[PDB]
Amino acid sequence: VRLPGLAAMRQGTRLFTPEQGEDLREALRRRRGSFQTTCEVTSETTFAAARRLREKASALAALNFASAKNPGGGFLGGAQAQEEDLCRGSGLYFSLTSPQAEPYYAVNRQSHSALYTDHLIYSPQVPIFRDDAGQLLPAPVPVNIITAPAPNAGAVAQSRPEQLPQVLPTLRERARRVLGVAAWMEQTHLVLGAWGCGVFRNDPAGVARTFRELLEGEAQGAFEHVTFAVLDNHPQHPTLGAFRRELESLCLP
Ligand SMILES: Nc1ncnc2c1ncn2[C@@H]1O[C@H](COP(=O)(O)OP(=O)(O)OC[C@H]2O[C@H](O)[C@H](O)[C@@H]2O)[C@@H](O)[C@H]1O
């Protein structure tokens, strides 16, 4: 049988096209300053942090460090990707494959460009069925998921180095659209993290700086709470450390 929650989530899945960029900037603008935003950096998975936020989050959203060209990443390379962790534990794949999200994949593929495009998919009330360990949750917990691909900085470096000056501007403006989806959908709690910093090989300090700059500027006080849940099993914890250091000025009471 189709799992509970899936049908309603798929039918409510929505595409944000690049032409919505100003609508997202306006939504951020209208919401800036609403709260004293609290921030934190944790070493949790995206869904551990979401499940810990749920009970006291009015509208909870999380970022999917998405593939531009295949729902769920096509399930290639293994279980170190965040997006495959999301599709393993939740109904997200059933949303990403929806007919209305298909332009995101078709256009990004048609771009023949490792910066990808400014399409974003919004997936309402995605049910989380399992925890990090794969055990069945007694009750699925719903989360709203924003799907956006960071620029593929590894592929720029190796395949089209004349786009190298475009990686950070791309990352910066698309991070702006992610927050703008969240503000347009009037989300209070956001689970962010090291978007683009593994398979896509973006620089962790650069990505956390870009989220810092936005949460101190255009998106300042637009959200109740922001969690940078940064899973990092590398020996020196360089990703988690880069986020912790770069986001120490924001994560203050
Ligand atoms: N469940 C997790 N939760 C939180 N953080 C995680 C998790 N898993 C990894 N991280 C950390 O977050 C960092 C980034 O996670 P990555 O998945 O590489 O994001 P990208 O945007 O650079 O690659 C996206 C591509 O890879 C996928 O296949 C997509 O389909 C795309 O094709 C990791 O280094 C971890 O430290």
Residue numbers in the entry: 29 to 281
List sentences from the manuscript:
The radio-resistant bacterium D. radiodurans encodes a PARG homolog, DrPARG, whose expression is upregulated after radiation damage, so it might play an important role in DNA repair. Our study demonstrates that DrPARG is involved in catalyzing the breakdown of endogenous PAR and DNA repair in D. radiodurans. From observing the structural peculiarities of DrPARG, we show that although previously thought to be an obligate exo-glycohydrolase, bacterial PARG could exert both exo- and endo-glycohydrolase functions.
Crystals were found in several similar conditions, but they belonged to different space groups. Notably, the 28 N-terminal residues of these solved structures from different space groups, including P21, P32, P3221, and P212121, were not well defined in the electron density maps, which suggests that this phenomenon did not result from crystal packing. In fact, the missing residues located in the intrinsically disordered N-terminal region of DrPARG and might be highly flexible. The structural flexibility may reflect the multiple space groups observed in X-ray crystallography because packing patterns are constantly influenced by the flexible regions during crystallization.
